């Protein structure tokens, strides 16, 4: 019962605060910036910071962290969550990248069979079947929520909105329940 | 203003590189910066020409910031019409209104403003600043002032948190800050808005020292590009801020820096 | 605090006489005062003995006030337990805490505090004062300071209302006042709380001059009872405040004094 | 003097460019200026040669102004004989009489004089000035002083309007201004005569800031013609003054101004 | 020294009356005081004659204290031979050694010493003081200084508790206190030794105000006996300290105090 | 810290010369130095690139030192990760933290810090310094300051030893040093930690003079290598320190030194 927050970008603190607010003694949250922390936790949530920053900071010492995460999701199949930029990194295909980077399709971690376009803020009521601070728009493709709002495929969860920016912590418990179910 | 704060809170733990052109802005995007502050490519210093800011804004997918003189509320109106990501009411540029500061409540674009103590930081947050940065000493490369101001603000906030209810009213008068924010700082135990470090950060060690002192990010000047390897030094300061608590990584990025 | 403001809102246009005993308090009641400030019947000046304040409180049907040193938050706790009508954190008494002022939010009893400028008046209202009075110069009988302070506060409030939205922030800093109240003063164009005049008011003309400068009432010292006719002089200052705009009445009460 | 005021009120909302020759004066006419201040094409600064002022006056259909040293009433008599459109008793030129100011009541030609506070502006209107401008800081391009003076005059006029009848007499003494005008400013709630902004206005944003602060127009130095495109930069300043409340247009003119 | 601190901790929440004779000492014993400081029954003030201290010690069952000039280490040796209960290195008496302070480690009798800031209370505790009191302003009856010093010491201790670990070393330097005690104050969050209030406490309200500000007890001067009712005024200040948080009792004891 | 003290005590009677490269470091090793202080091979002076320190560390079998700005506690972590032999919190480099000094207790690598009096030396030893050196005056070559500071520290230590137990408490306050160390200096009659001489030592006579005044070694600048014979001049200063009491040898090394 140990979930981690990838603390190489911004927005990790609100994610940690709202996970702790649920007030469960068994649940412990630690920062994740290296492979050691990645192996310590049984789950992982990618805070909705920058997408470029996360990928560059995940390519230190010949993709040491990037390979750890990619192997982590695609082999151990442990629960993972991605908000805002998290969805961008969790989508196999992402476009609207004018610069011809050599990364190609390995820029995104993958896991969700969806096509996303990052390219502004408002509030939307979640008609589950949310403060969208520059929420990416999904172009191509079970949908957990819609207003599409949340997509959960296998152990991977994706939310284009920022639940941690609102008082309610329902989604934080939802991923904790997902982690407990996997455990 | 809540959405501006939420957007800024997503801005924590990053590096903002003060770029001067499109090639520099591209370097800072590959290096992993979260935003680029558009500068004047080489007296009275005025806001950069909006055609230059608009050039960079379409060549980088990361945030773009711009500088407006202290009090010049019509340069800000020009930039806000440009759909920029965040405006910096800066003291590096010549002061337009030495007595007043833009009324940042009238703009939809978040503002970042300097600060040398908690009283000054709380005043600017009252006026509507969505972010703060320690003034330091721009153009010198000396982290003496940035560290001095970081400690001063950090000490005052904690000393405040250790005070009592009846003593808060005098403290607000002492630092000359609105009482509402002074209580908000007491409750949160930190500055109510995102706080970055600016002025003097030139080395991966300097960036990590500021982060180890509490700040949420770093503002790095143009020294990164006036060096032997701009791309490598830039990615070094980015990794330092991302891994500011890892001495092994800090050593690794500091080796062969030039 | 709204309830405290409502009660003070009924204190407008009245005279508060600083009495020293029960006979003086009875004179001030029959003279038409709205309240009596209990004093020490005489080198450190402390709050009067609560047995004296309790004696007067039961011998007059009008408000009873009392004085507590600046910062002494345990004299106030004693008086609040006494069910007094309104406490005065006064600079005439020796300063118990030179550096702080009682936290007046913790008490149910409305407070009044001195003020020499708009910044000082707005700070005290932030701390929880339900009324203000111009410090003036107590014990001298000279209305020079009271009139100087009344003008200073009145000028600042109006100059404020003539300002702009972006200039208010710098003004609040200059006077060193909370921004929330500074905007409230601008909206109302006057001090957010009842404002009385204190220090130097010794003649019906002095009382009416203060009320003609926009105050809501007068604090009147002990000069009335150290005079030939205390009952007549008292009723004169009461009529001056009630009819401060009628020169015929002011002449009538000033004659044969 | 009333007819001079009538002419000046027709002067509101315009731009006066300090030109140095016929070609510059023609540029400023096509750029849409309302008047041109004839300058010396160049250690004592004296009134320009009247033969230069006559050549420009006959080559432009807009108002022509000229500068005379403070107190030098015989230079004014020369220009007044030249049938110029408005004389400028200017502090930029060397002071001829440090103690006195031309008696502008004796001339038919309207005068414009500098001012740094309401008291000084009211004194010059008493002497006969038909228009005022804020001294600012000529030759520097810094709008710090122009904005500081605009606020100072604006604050004093409003603070005056908020005063009382018996308090006006003390105010007049404090600012040292004639009581008759002090009451006239109170009744009108603004300066009795047209008021322009001068000193530091170098960018379309600077021009619009001054107009957004109340001023009736802008005096623009020679920076327009010591720049890449004089016609466009001049045209930009005029559009800013005409559309000082339209951020969309202010952005448009500011783009590609270099 | 631990035994001395153990005895002192048993002295918390009490009142020490500065008596002048046996009748006054008997009054202060029946009034409920925990100890009596023997005084000189009256221009150089010296330690009272030990025969006076000896007579009171045998006529009261409560602690007996005595005052020795600052630095006079032979008056202390006389009193220690007298088997007194506490010695008071007093600034009220003339200073025998303005340079030094008795070496209180050599005595078996606990010492109490004045203090005006945390840096001075910590130095005296280093020398060997087992109790501290705030100097205040003796003989005036004004609680202004006692309250000022109580706040100053209380603020510094809490500001300390809010500091970091590398900042403690500089704080110790600036207040000029031993580093070992500074860390001990931080860990305990209060002064390492019992702390009493002295100077100006003349009314039940004054005594309770000091206790409501943290102090562990009160030193009350001779004003209690130069009053209409010494027994009633004495028992009033005793009840104020015992019930310093009970406004009902504080009112009750304050009524008819004359 | 005892292990650091034991290792440092093995550094007594040696010469540490500030080298700039690997050839200079090789000269220093052959000349008999015990350690080499790696320098920047040249506005703001910062810690050298850890790749330079690593290259020297691998080409010399003697101790390797490095300099970190005063207070910059993140350069130290970089060097400590490098497995350097001793770090130098240097006043020659620009001051990173004007107010604080690295908390040298958190590092396993011994630190050496400057000092100009006994109070300053005792404070740094409190913070965790394992060695001291006299600041002197770097870059001048004048031994005036080094000798002045050596005498000042020596006089204070002995004057301290000639005092009484009651006077020690005031002395600690006067020099502003921890009382625990002040007593330790008295007991040992010398500085509790190894003490070297730095600043101005440029000649075999200068080195021997410092050692004849009771130091444990000398820090030698770069003047050894900006001279005709670097190897001979280096071995001269080494022999002077080894034989500082032998005028015959001191003459021998001093002849043809230049």
From Swiss-Prot, chain A:
It comes from the Eukaryota. Its main location: cytoplasm. Its EC number is 4.3.3.6, 3.5.1.2. GO terms for molecular function: glutaminase activity; pyridoxal 5'-phosphate synthase (glutamine hydrolysing) activity. GO terms for cellular component: cytosol; glutaminase complex. Signal peptide: none annotated. Pathway: Cofactor biosynthesis; pyridoxal 5'-phosphate biosynthesis. InterPro entries: Class_I_gatase-like, PdxT/SNO, PdxT/SNO_CS. It is found in: Cytoplasm. The active site is at 84 (nucleophile), 162 (charge relay system), 164 (charge relay system). This is Pyridoxal 5'-phosphate synthase subunit PDX2. It comes from Plasmodium falciparum (isolate 3D7). The gene is PDX2.
Curated annotation (Swiss-Prot), chains B, D, E, F:
D-glyceraldehyde 3-phosphate binds at residue 151. Keywords: Cytoplasm, Lyase, Pyridoxal phosphate, Schiff base. Its EC number is 4.3.3.6. It comes from the Eukaryota. One of its GO terms (biological process) is pyridoxal phosphate biosynthetic process. Gene3D superfamilies: Aldolase class I (3.20.20.70). Coiled coil: none annotated. Changing residue 72 to A: No activity. No complexes formed. Pathway: Cofactor biosynthesis; pyridoxal 5'-phosphate biosynthesis. One of its GO terms (cellular component) is cytosol. The active site is at 67 (schiff-base intermediate with d-ribose 5-phosphate). Belongs to the PdxS/SNZ family. This is Pyridoxal 5'-phosphate synthase subunit Pdx1. It comes from Plasmodium falciparum (isolate 3D7). The gene is pdx1.
């Amino acid at each position: 019962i140990t979930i981690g927050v990838l603390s190489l970008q911004g927005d990790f603190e609100p994610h940690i605060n709202h996970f702790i607010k649920l007030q469960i003694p068994s649940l412990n949250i630690i920062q994740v910036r290296n492979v050691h922390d990645l192996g310590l936790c049984d789950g992982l949530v990618i805070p909705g910071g920058e997408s470029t920053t996360v990928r560059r900071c995940c390519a230190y010492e010949q993709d040491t962290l990037y390979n750890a995460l990619v192997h982590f999701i695609h082999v151990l199949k442990k629960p993972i969550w991605g908000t805002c930029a998290g969805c961008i990194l969790l989508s196999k295909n992402v476009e609207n990248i004018k610069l011809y980077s050599n990364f190609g399709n390995k820029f995104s971690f993958g896991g969700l069979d969806i096509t996303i376009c990052r390219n502004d803020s408002f509030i939307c009521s979640l008609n589950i079947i949310a403060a969208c601070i520059r929420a990416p728009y999904i172009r191509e493709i079970k949908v957990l929520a819609t207003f599409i709002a949340a997509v959960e495929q296998n152990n991977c969860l994706g939310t284009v909105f920022n639940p941690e920016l609102l008082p309610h912590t329902a989604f934080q418990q939802y991923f904790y329940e997902k982690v407990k179910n996997y455990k | 203003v809540l959405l501006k704060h939420g957007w800024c809170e997503m801005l924590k733990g990053g590096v903002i590189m003060d770029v001067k052109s499109v090639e520099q802005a591209k370097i800072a995007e590959e290096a992993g910066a979260i935003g680029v502050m558009v500068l004047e490519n080489i007296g009275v210093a005025r806001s950069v020409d909006p055609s230059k800011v608009e050039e960079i804004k379409k060549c980088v997918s990361i945030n773009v910031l711009a500088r407006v003189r202290i009090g010049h509320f019509v340069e800000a109106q020009i930039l806000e019409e440009l759909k920029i990501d965040m405006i910096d009411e800066s003291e590096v540029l010549t002061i337009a209104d030495e007595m007043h500061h833009i009324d940042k409540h009238k703009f939809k674009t978040p503002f970042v403003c300097g600060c040398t103590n908690l009283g000054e930081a709380l005043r600017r947050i009252s006026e509507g600043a969505s972010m703060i940065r320690t003034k330091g000493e721009a153009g010198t490369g000396n982290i003496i002032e940035a560290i001095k101001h970081i400690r001063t603000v950090n000490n005052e906030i904690c000393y405040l948190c250790c005070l009592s209810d009846s003593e808060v009213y005098h403290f607000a008068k002492k630092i000359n800050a609105p009482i509402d924010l002074v209580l908000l700082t007491k409750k949160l135990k930190r500055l109510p808005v995102v706080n970055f470090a600016a002025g003097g950060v030139a080395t991966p060690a300097d960036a990590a020292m500021c982060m180890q002192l509490g700040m949420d990010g770093v503002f790095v000047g143009s020294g990164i590009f006036e060096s032997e390897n701009p791309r490598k030094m830039a990615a070094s300061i980015v990794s330092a801020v991302s891994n500011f608590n890892n001495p092994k990584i800090l050593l690794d990025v500091s080796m062969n820096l030039g």
